[PDB]
Amino acid sequence: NSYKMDYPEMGLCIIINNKNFHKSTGMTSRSGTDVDAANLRETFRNLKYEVRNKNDLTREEIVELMRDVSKEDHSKRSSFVCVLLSHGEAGIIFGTNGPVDLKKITNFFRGDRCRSLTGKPKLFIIQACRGTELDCGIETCHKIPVEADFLYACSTAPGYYSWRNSKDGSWFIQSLCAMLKQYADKLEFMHILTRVNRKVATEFESFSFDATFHAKKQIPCIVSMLTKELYFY
């Protein structure tokens, strides 16, 4: 009923942290993202993941990184974690010089394409916009599918902007790290992520001099194709 998490290694945690984008793209610098990346590094280090931080990657460097990691031998590793911190749109995360399709990235890890991860949880944690909607809130052959064992922990609902504080980091990553620190020794991962949903939904609200962007809310979106319960302990 739960994934085997007592392989010799918990696995890799790849963190792609895009802060500065090529001028020609017109994309703004993502102030606060270094806070997220540092928090994520410490959070996952404590969970015994082998963390690799990558900063300011082009669209082709992202693809090449993911391809290479998917070709590593993960036989001794329990799981795989990839964190993407960038601008985005529906289905898309941005490299510093242009977009990468998320499906292209995740496909490298399919059950038939990365055999040393077949049957093990593959977790993709994404802090990026998924569109431009704002939430105004309301007061008060084979044997297993190749798409199985993926979880996407998305920072925001489909179609919506995702919020990041330039001083504190992104709402979602702040909350995800806090909940993992507090509950990773107590709760199954889906229940941890539900607590993240509640923390983001209840404790954060945007403040802006621009009325269009002021007093806005956010709900993260858990997408699970997992087949077992996931415990980090």
């Binding site: 919020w163 504080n165 962007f213």
Partner: peptide, 4 residues
């Protein structure tokens, strides 16, 4: 607060 900023959007991504």
């Amino acid at each position: 607060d900023e959007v991504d």
